[PDB]
Point group: C5
Chain length 394, copies 5
C-alpha cells in the first residue's frame, strides 16, 4: 500500500457494509445492548392529563462482528468516529410514550477495534403515569420508564445494564434543583415480558421517584385561610343590637366564597374526589356558618318587637347561674286628666323595661358563645400543627 | 458459494426488488392486509370542537410473492429484519382525520420465509366525532375509527382482522385509567363501501365506547349549589322589621350570579342548547327569587307609613284561623289646656297601636311562608336523590 | 421476452423518465388539470385575526404522453400504482394562505393506459378571509378559496373542473355537523387572472358560504339580560322611606357592570365598532339608570329635614287630579307654665304633619312612575320579539 | 439528431451541471440578484415581546452562464421550467429573524435562454422590532426588514431592486384590510454594511409603516369611563343626613377599581412606564376621591352628637353672603313641679335647634361644592374633546 | 488542461472526498475549533419553569488538510463557497438544552486555500437556568451557556476562542433593548471537564448577566398600594356613632383582598417562598386590620345600651390629662300625680346624660388613635423611600 492518509481504514470496513442486516456471524446469537440513564430535569407534571415530561441523558453500546480490524498495520489506531446513519442501530423505545419530544441529533458514534459501538444521545420524553393526589402538598410519585425493543424478540435483542444498579440508584449529580420537584432515586429492574409462548420481549424498567417541595403551597392557600379566622375573632366585639354585625358576617362569607373558587382552579384533583386539603376547607366553612348562625340568634332575641316577659324558668337558669361560670267637681275632673296622662307614661317606661331584661340575657349568651367558639378555633389549631410536626420530624 | 456471512440472503432478495409495484404474481388477486388495534390512552376530548385525541397500538400483516426463499441452504434461517423504506407498504388511513398526530417511526419489519410481512407501529390520531352532551356528568360516547385504503379499490387491497372480533371487544389490558374517561369496549365491524358501480373500497370500522367518570363534577358544582340553600334557610330567622333582611337576600343573589358565570365557562354545551344540569339551575334561581319576593312583601306590610286599620275581613281570616293551623273661669281655662295635651298624647299612642296589629299580621305570614318554603326545598331534595339512585343501582 | 413477473411494465416506462420536464410532446399545448373539492369540517373561525381553518378532500387529474402503453402484450393490464415522488406533479396552490397546515401524505397515484394520472389527497388549509360581525349571532359568511398555479402561466397549465358545477354546489354529504357552523353551498367559478399583457394565470375560485347556529348565544347572554330586568320589577315594591331601596339599586348596577365585562371578553368585534347586540345593551343600561334616577328623586322628596309646606299649586295638581288617572297670682303663674308646655307640643305635632303630606305626594309619584316604567319594559319587550319572528319565518 | 420529444434540451444543460459552484465564467464578477416585495397581511403584533408576524409575497432573479442555449435548433423554445433543488440558489436571509415561519415550497423556477432564472415564493416571517406605546390607540410603527446574504461578501453577491423604488412605496394592492392595522407605505433603501476592511455585506432594507385603527378602543375603555362619571352626578342628589350617601360612593369606587384591573390586563405597556391613556385614568381617580372627600365632610358637619353653637364668624360668612353667590304652700309646691317639667322640655327643643342651624350650613356647602365639581367635570370634558379634534382634522 | 470555467477547482477537491472521517493527516492531532458569540435578544424568561429563551449569532472555524490547494494555477482564486452538507462538520452542542429551537439554515461555508473553513449561523436556543427571585423587581441573573463536543474527547476536538475574552465581555452592539431585560456582560471561560481518567471533554462556558428593568412594576403594584392608604386616612374623618364607619372599613378590606389575589397571579415565586415584596404587603395588611380593630373599639364604647357611669379612675386619667397632650286632700292628690310625672322625666334626661360622657370619652380616644396611626404610616413611608435611594445611588 501507500500512505495517502488514514481514511483508508474507513474505506476498508464501510465499502461492502450493509446497514440493514442485524450484524452477527452466526444468526443464533442475540445482540446484547447495554444501557443506562442519568436524570437531568423534570420539565412538567400534568396532574389532570396524567402526563409526565422529563429530559434525560442516555447512552448505550453493543457489539458487531463486521466492524473489526487489527490495530496494527493501520498505524496503531484503536478507535474512530463513524456517522450514525451508515451502521446498524437497534430500535430501543419506551412503552409509555404518548407523544414525541424534540431532542437534538448526535451524528457520530465511536467504534473500537473489537466491534464495541458506543452511542451517546440526549432525549426529551413525554410519558404517561399514574399520579395520586391523596395528600396534595406532601406527595411522592412513582413513575415508570420501560426501555424495550419494539420489534425484535429476546433471541434477537437482549438488554443489560452498563454499570451496576447501585450506582444508578445513588446518582444525583447533574439534576436541576429549585424547580418544585426533588429527585429521590432512580432504581432499575430487569423483567422478561412475554405475550405467549415463543414470543418474549426483553425490557428494562426504571422507576423514578420524585417528591414535591411543599413550600409553594403554604403562602398561596394557608396564609389567607388563617387570615379570615382572625377577622371573625375581632368581629364578635360588635354589640349585637347595633345592626352592622349581620352585615359584617355576610360580607366576609362572600369574601371567602370568592377565595374557594379562585384557588381551586389552580389545584387539581383526579380519581379520588378531593385530597385531604379539601376536607380541611369544609371544616373552615362549617366553622364560619356557626359564626353566622349564632349572630342570627342573638339579633332575634335582642330586638324591640313589642314582646313579653322573659320566662322566670330561663331567668333563674341564665342570669343567676352563669354569674359564677363565665363572668363574675273641678278637683275630680282635673284628677281624671292627670291619672290618664300618668297611665300613658307608665305604659311607656315598662316598654323600656322590655329590652333591658332581654338585653341582659342577650349579652350573657354572647359572652358564653364567644368562649366556646374561641376554644373550637384553638382546639382545631393545635390539631393542624401536631400533624405537621409528625411529617417534619424525619 | 462461500461462507462470508449470512447477509447473502438479504443480497439475494433485495437486489432487483422494485418497491413501487403491488407485489403479486397474477395481477388479478388482491393483497389482503390483516389489522387489529388495542387501546392505550384517551388524551383529550374537546366537546366544543367535536374532536377526539387518542393513542393506540397498531399492527398489520400482508403477503408478497417477491420475498420468498427456501429456509434450507441459507443455514436454516426462517425470518429476518428488513428496513421499512425498502419494501412495498400499503396506504391504510382513517376517514375521520382532521389533523396529523406526531408518533415515533419504527424502521424495521419482519419477513417470514413465505412472504408474511409483519409491521408493528404506534400512532397518535386526532379524529372528529359526534358528542352528545344531553346529560353532562353521566354520558357515554360512541366514536368511530374507520380504517380504509385511500386509493386502491377492493380488487387491489382487501382488509380483514388479525384475530376474532370477540378478543378485540374484551381487551382492556394496557389502558391507562385515572384519567376522567373509562374504556368500555372496542367493537369492530367490516362494511364494503362503494361510491358507484365498479369502484368499491373495503373498510374496517372500530367503535370505541367511553364513559365519563362523574366524580369530578360533584365537588365543583354540586357542593356550592347545596351550600347557598342552607344560607337562605338561616336567612329567614331575621325579623322583618330590622332592615338588614333585604340587604341580606340581595347579597347572596349577587353571590350566586357570580357562581353561575364562573362555572359555565368550564362546562360545554353543543347542538342541544343546555344539558339537564342547566335545567336544574334555573330551578335553583326560581327557588331563590321566591325567597326574595316574600321578604319584599312582609317589609311592605310591616312598616310605619301612617297607615290605617287592618281589615276585619283579614283579621278574622288570619289571626284567629291560623292559630290552629301552624302555631298554637280659671278652672275652665286650665281644663281646656289639659284636655288639649291629653288629645296630643291619645293621638300618639294609637299610632303606636298602628304597628302592633300589623306586626302581628306580618309575623303570622312569616311563619306560614317559612313552612311552605321549607317543604319545597325538602320536596325537591328527595327528587334529586331518587333520580341518582336509579343511575347508581346497576 | 420471458414471464418473470409483471413489474416489467414499470421497468418499461420509468427507465428513462425525467421527472423535471413538463410532460408534452409538442411544447405549445398546455397541460390541463381538472380539480374538485368536497368539504369535510370547519375547524376554527377566528373573527379577531380574520383567519379561517378548514379541512377538505381534494382530487385532480391531468394527462401526460410519456406514461402510455398498449394494454395488450402486458397481460391486459389497464392501470397501476406508481409512487408520487417519481413523476411530474403540478404546483396548485391557494392564494389565501397565511400558514401551512399539517396533512397526511398519499404516496401513490393511479395511471391509466392513456396517460390519465389521478391523484387523491386530503389537505388542511388555513386561509385569510373577510368576516362581517354586523349582526353577531345571525350571520352568514362568504369565504373564498382560489386554486391557482403559482409559477406557470396559462399557456403551460390550465385549470378546469372535474364534474359540472351543479354537483359541486349541492354536495353536503360527508360534512361534520353539530359544530356551531352550518355549510350552505360551495360554488365554483373560473376567472382568468392577468397581471399585464402576455402573463396570464388561470385560476379556479370556490366560494364557501357558512352560517352560524345561533342557539349557543341565547343562553349565555340573553338569559341573564332578561333576568336582571325582573329583579328591578320586584325592586320597586320597597317603600321609599325605608333606606335599603337606594342600596338595593346600586348593588345590581354593580352586578350588571360585572356582566358586561365578563361576556364582552368572549364576543369579538372588528372593523365596525360594535354589532347590533351592543346597541341592545346600551338600551339595557339606559333603562336601568332611569330606574336609579327615579328612586334618587323620591328619597329626596320623602325625608325629614325640617322642610316647609307642600305648594298648593302642586297639591291640587297632584293629589286631587291623579285620583282619577292611576288610583281610585298663682292661677296666672301656673297658666303661663302650661301654655308654654302646650306650645312646646303644638310645635312638635305639626312637624309630624310635615311628613304626612310629603309622604302622600311621594307615594302618588311612586305609583305613577311605576306604571310608566312598566310600559317601557313591555313596549321594548315586544319589539325584541317581533324582530326575532321576522328572522325565524323563512 | 432525432425528434423523440423536447426533453432533450433539459438533457443538454443539466447533464454535467454542478449545483454547488457559484455560477460564473470569470470568478471576479459578482452575481447580482434583484428582489422586491409586496405586502399581504399583518398577522400579529406582540407589544410585550417586541415581535412582529407578517406574510409577504417575494420574487427574485439572477443570471448564470451555465444555463444558456440558442433558441433555434431546439424548436424555438425560449423558456422552460426546472425544479428548484437542481440549480444554484442564493442564500438571502433577514437579519431580524427570531424564529422560522411555516410557508409553502415552490418546486419550480423559470429559465430564459440568456440565463435569467426567476424565482417566485411566498414566505411567512417573524421578526423583532421596536414598538413605541407612548400614545396607545393613535400610534404609527416603523418596522424594518433587512434582506442580506448571510455568508457571501459584496464581491460575490450583490443586491439590487427589481423595479424602481417609487412603485414599491405606492403599492397597496393585495393587502388584507379590516384587521386592526392599516398599511401606509413600504419604502426600500440600499446600504452597504461592513464589519471591517475587506469584508463588506450588501443589504437591502425595507421599512414598513403601519398605523393602528383606533375604533376598537373607544367602546372598550372610553364608554365605561364616561359612564361612571354620570352615576356620580346623580349621586349628589341624595341629601347628606340620610345615611346611604356614604355607602353609595364607596360602592362605585369599588366598582371602578375592578374596571382598572380587568382592562389593564389587555392593554400593554413597555419601556416607557405608561402611555398617555394611563395619565388620563389617574385624573379619573383623583376626580372621584374628591367626590368621596366632600361627602365625608358634610356628614361630619351634619350629624347629632350633642354639639355646640355654629360660630357667628362662620354664620355671617356663610348663610348671609352665599345668598347672592349661588342661591337666591300647695300653690308653690305644684309650681316647683311644673317649672321643672318645663325645664326638661326647654332643654329638649333647643337640642332640636342644634341641627337646624347645622343642617342649614350643611346644605349651602353641598350646593356650593356641587357647582364646583360640575365645572371641573365640564372643564376637563372639553379638553378631552379639543385634543381629539386636533388628531381628526388632517 | 483547458479553460471551460473555474468549477474545475471544485471538481478537484470534492471528487474523492469522504465527509465521514475526521479530517487530519496524522490521527494523533486534535481538530481545534474556534468559536465566539454575540447576543441578539432575550425572548422569554420563565421564572416558574426555570427556562430561558434567547437568540444569538454564532460563528466558528477549524482546519482540515483535505481542502487545500495552491492559489496559482487556478487563476489566483483564494477562497470559494462550498455547500455545508458535503464536508465534515463538528458537533458542538450546549449542555443546558431542554428543547430544540427553530432557526434558519445556512447552506454555505467559506474555504480558504490553507484549509480554514469558516461557518456563520444564527441559532435560537432554549436553556435551563437557576433564577433567584429573592428581590423581585431589582434582580440580576447569572445564566450559563456551555458549548461542548457531545461525543469526541479532548484528543479529538478541542475548543478555543476566536478573539480575546476582553472583546467578548464588552460587546453590546446589536442587542435589542426596550424589552424588560438589559444585557450587562457576556464573559467566557474555558474549563476542562472529565468524567474519569482518559475521558476528558473540552468545553467553553459563557456567562450571560441580565438585569430586569424595574419600571414596569412601579405602576402595576406600587400605585394601588399607596392609593388604598389615603382612602383610609380620609376614612377616619367619619364620626364613630354614625353607623357607616364600620361598613366603610370592611368594604375596602374586601377591595384590597381582591387586589392581593389578582396581582399575585402575575408575579412568580420559586424555591424561597416569597420575595421581599411579599413581606411588604403583609405589613400593608397588618396596618389595615389595626385600622379596623380601632373602629371596632370606639363603636363598642360609643353606643346606647342602658350603660352605667364612666369610671372616675378613667375620667381623671382621660379627659383632664389629655387636654394638654393632644388637644387644647286634692292639693295632695294632684301633687302625687305631678311628682310621679317629674320622676318619669328625670329618669329620662339622665339617660341622655349617659351618652354625653361616653361620647366625650369616645372622641378623645378617636383623636388620640388618629395621631398614632398617622405617624405609623409616616414612619413606614420614609423607610420605604430610604431603601430605594440606596439602590438608586450608583
Ligand atoms: C414503585 O412501584 C413499584 C411497583 O412496580 C415498586 O414495587 C415493588 O418493589 C419491589 C422492590 O422495590 C419489587 O420486588 C416488587 O416486584 C415491586 N412490585 C411490583 C408489582 O413490581 C417500587 O418499590 C415503588 N417505589 C416506591 C418508592 O415505593
Ligand atoms: C456567575 O456565576 C459564576 C459561577 O460559576 C461566577 O463565579 C465565579 O467567578 C470567578 C470569576 O468571575 C471565577 O474565578 C470562579 O471560578 C467562579 N466560580 C465558579 C464556581 O466557577 C460569576 O462571577 C458570576 N457572575 C456574576 C456577575 O456574579
Ligand atoms: C455532558 C457531556 N459533555 C460531553 C459529553 N457529554 C455527555 C455525557 C457525559 C457523561 C455522561 C453521560 C451519561 C449518560 C448516561 C449515563 C451516564 C453518563 N455520563 C457519565 C453523557 O451523556
Amino acid at each position: 500500500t501507500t500512505q495517502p492518509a488514514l481514511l483508508r481504514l474507513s474505506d476498508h470496513l464501510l465499502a461492502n457494509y450493509k446497514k440493514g442486516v442485524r450484524p452477527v456471524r452466526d444468526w443464533r446469537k442475540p445482540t446484547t445492548v447495554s444501557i443506562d440513564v442519568i436524570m437531568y430535569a423534570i420539565l412538567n407534571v400534568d396532574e389532570k392529563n396524567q402526563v409526565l415530561t422529563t429530559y434525560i441523558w442516555y447512552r448505550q453500546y453493543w457489539t458487531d462482528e463486521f466492524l473489526q480490524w487489527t490495530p496494527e498495520d493501520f498505524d496503531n489506531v484503536t478507535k474512530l468516529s463513524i456517522p450514525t446513519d451508515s451502521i446498524w442501530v437497534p430500535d430501543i423505545l419506551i412503552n409509555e410514550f404518548v407523544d414525541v419530544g424534540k431532542s437534538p441529533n448526535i451524528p457520530y458514534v465511536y467504534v473500537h477495534h473489537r466491534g464495541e459501538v458506543q452511542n451517546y444521545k440526549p432525549l426529551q420524553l413525554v410519558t404517561a403515569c399514574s399520579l395520586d393526589i391523596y395528600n396534595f402538598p406532601f406527595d411522592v410519585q412513582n413513575c415508570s420508564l420501560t426501555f424495550t425493543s419494539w420489534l425484535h424478540t429476546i433471541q434477537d435483542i437482549n438488554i443489560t445494564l452498563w454499570r451496576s444498579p447501585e450506582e444508578v440508584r445513588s446518582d444525583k449529580s447533574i439534576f436541576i434543583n429549585q424547580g418544585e420537584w426533588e429527585l429521590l432515586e432512580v432504581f432499575p429492574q430487569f423483567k422478561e415480558f412475554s405475550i405467549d409462548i415463543s414470543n418474549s420481549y426483553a425490557e428494562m424498567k426504571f422507576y423514578v421517584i420524585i417528591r414535591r417541595r411543599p413550600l409553594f403551597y403554604a403562602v398561596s392557600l394557608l396564609l389567607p385561610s388563617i387570615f379570615l379566622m382572625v377577622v371573625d375573632i375581632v368581629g364578635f366585639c360588635l354589640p349585637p343590637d347595633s345592626g352592622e354585625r349581620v352585615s359584617f358576617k355576610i360580607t366576609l362569607l362572600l369574601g371567602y366564597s370568592v377565595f374557594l373558587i379562585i384557588v381551586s382552579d389552580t389545584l387539581p384533583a383526579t380519581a379520588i374526589g378531593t385530597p385531604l386539603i379539601g376536607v380541611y376547607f369544609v371544616v373552615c366553612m362549617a366553622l364560619l356558618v356557626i359564626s353566622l348562625a349564632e349572630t342570627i340568634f342573638i339579633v332575634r332575641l335582642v330586638h324591640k318587637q313589642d314582646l313579653q316577659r322573659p320566662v322566670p324558668d330561663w331567668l333563674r337558669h341564665l342570669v343567676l347561674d352563669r354569674i359564677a361560670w363565665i363572668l363574675c267637681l273641678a278637683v275630680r275632673g282635673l284628677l281624671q286628666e292627670l291619672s290618664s296622662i300618668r297611665h300613658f307614661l307608665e305604659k311607656r317606661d315598662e316598654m323600656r323595661e322590655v329590652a333591658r331584661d332581654w338585653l341582659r340575657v342577650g349579652y350573657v349568651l354572647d359572652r358564653l358563645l364567644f368562649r366556646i367558639y374561641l376554644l373550637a378555633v384553638l382546639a382545631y389549631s393545635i390539631t393542624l400543627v401536631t400533624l405537621w410536626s409528625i411529617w417534619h420530624y424525619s
